[PDB]
Amino acid sequence: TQVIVSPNIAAVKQGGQQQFTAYVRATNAKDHKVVWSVEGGSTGTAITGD
Amino acid sequence: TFNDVKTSLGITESYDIVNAIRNSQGDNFKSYVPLATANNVAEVGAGILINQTVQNDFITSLVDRIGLVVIRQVSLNNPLKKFKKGQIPLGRTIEEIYTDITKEKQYDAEEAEQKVFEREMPNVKTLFHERNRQGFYHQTIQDDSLKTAFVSWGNFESFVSSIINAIYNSAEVDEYEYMKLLVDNYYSKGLFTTVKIDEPTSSTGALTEFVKKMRATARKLTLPQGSRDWNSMAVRTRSYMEDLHLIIDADLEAELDVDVLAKAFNMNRTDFLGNVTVIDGFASTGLEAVLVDKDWFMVYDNLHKMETVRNPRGLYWNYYYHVWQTLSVSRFANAVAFVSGDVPAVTQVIVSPNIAAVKQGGQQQFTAYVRATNAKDHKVVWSVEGGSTGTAITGDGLLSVSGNEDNQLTVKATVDIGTEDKPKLVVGEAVVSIRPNNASGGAQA
Amino acid sequence: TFNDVKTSLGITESYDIVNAIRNSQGDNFKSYVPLATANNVAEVGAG
Amino acid sequence: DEPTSSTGALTEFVKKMRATARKLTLPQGSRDWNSMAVRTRSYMEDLHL
Helix, strand or coil, rough: CCCCCCCCCCCCCCCCCCCCCCECCCCCCCCCCCCCCCCCEEEEEECCCC | CCCCCCCCCCCCCCCCCCCCCCCCCCCCHHHHHCCCCCCHHHCCCCCCCCCCCCCCCCCCEEEEECEEEEEEEECCCCCCHHHEEEEEECCEEEEEECCCCCCCCCCCCCHHHCCCCCCCCCEEEEEEEEEEEEEEEEEEEEECCCCCCCCCCCHHHHHHHHHHHHHHHHHHHHHHHHHHHHHHCCCCCCCEEEECCCCCCCCCCCCCCHHHHHHHHHHHCCCCEEEEECCCCCEEEECCCCCEEEEEEEHHHHHHCCCCCCCCCCCHHHCCEEEEEEECCCCCCEEEEEEEEECCCCCCEEEEEEEEECCCCCCCEEEEEEEEECCCCCCCCCCCEECCCCCEEEEEEEEEECCEEECCCCCEECCEEEECCCCCCCCCCEEECCCCCCCCCEEECCCCCCCCCCCCCCEEEEEECCCCCCCCCCEEEEEEEEECCCCCCCCCC | CCCCCCCCCCCCCCCCCCCCHCCCCCCCCCCCCCCCCCCCHCCCCCC | CCCCCHHHHHHHHHHHHHHHHHCCCCCCCCCCCCCCCCCCCCCCCCCCC
């Protein structure tokens, strides 16, 4: 029903990096794949998954 | 320092409350039609994640000014703190020694001529608990940059104080959560004595299906002759019923409390035996609850140090909170796993002395207990790893160390649940080393 | 007298709780990701 | 029947034992209930379920 990406706000240095984590609201007894993405970046600036 | 923030950030509308429905109802949402500002509430009523400088409605270029700051604050506690056995200063490992019973011999006077000084060593299991957890908690308080975000002395000390308790709640949560790993570890390893609770082989009327099993198996742990089959070492231990602690899912306590305890004229005949501690439920799949002795937990403290340092160039404090612990689990204590979902047939195979020092040309008897759910009596295949042509094991686990080895052997007890696949082998193992023998050299016959 | 041995001795395990913790970013295990020393608890703690 | 089958087979098992324990601990005992068919009797404090 909801995916909660946890920190919700980052002020990352140019060049530096940041850890994110996503809480998935499974309403049933399963596990669901998370796909991470970054839109609006330059050439580079990727999120690795995870 | 933001822009273009949509106000619908993490929002997955399962339905749009307005445009799908309230404008178009003819139905159950009719009680919201006489409200007129229902669309202003449906826009920003669930909270707003990112603040926006909203100008005033009547006078633009007047900023709308946050006008109440509440500071939420919670204190977390470890419910499992009563499973700790104190502090270990000056030492790293723990030695846990358990002698158990032996097998009787038949009275025979003819064989007693040569066996008066025959030496039959006791069955002793030993168990070592290393210091595991050595971690610290890191926390900065820039006292000077935070005075920006407050205009009240009073919200500034009600925010600095929460970062203090943020350390003391972080430590107490992982102290809850490390001890909850030891259950999910021990089950993953196959070391829990699996008992199904949600397989009612009976007819209808199985509301108390789990209560009759968790009061029988709770009684079986306390029979004065003891039992072999509740430890992961397969030793004949015993519980005294005052030390039986039952860490239970919160989903499962209400199954007891509703389906059993109401409509119970005599609740002492249907309470769970032993002390009951509710957790939220375990990480493991199908694992509902776990019944253990008080001795099953080998949790110990080593440090609790709060240190601090000041940075004069960054105008801040670091806070370091070191918690060092010895987080361990007695394999000698009874520990029963009340599980629900479908399980393997064999969860553990226990090879009996677990270690040995057998001289070249000597021999050693081995026994494999098989922790099996429903008793298909799985056949055991013995094996030796790391030997030469000489050393072999046969039949009911009788090792024959060759005269020509010096290698540290691995004795296996292979049980195959599986079928035409990459099959399911349940292999228990033991370690045999070898003393050298001056066995007169050369050749024979 | 014993000179080299693994510490997972004898243990035949259903699921491995190192790949259960790390390789499930989904659910049921995310409470154990913020543990720092979870390797030396999960691969020792049984004894 | 089988004392796991239903809650009726549980109850009937509770019926047959309070019946049998009374039959044992009647005075004027029976030649039933032992393997020599001795007319013995028993006492309630002596019965052990």
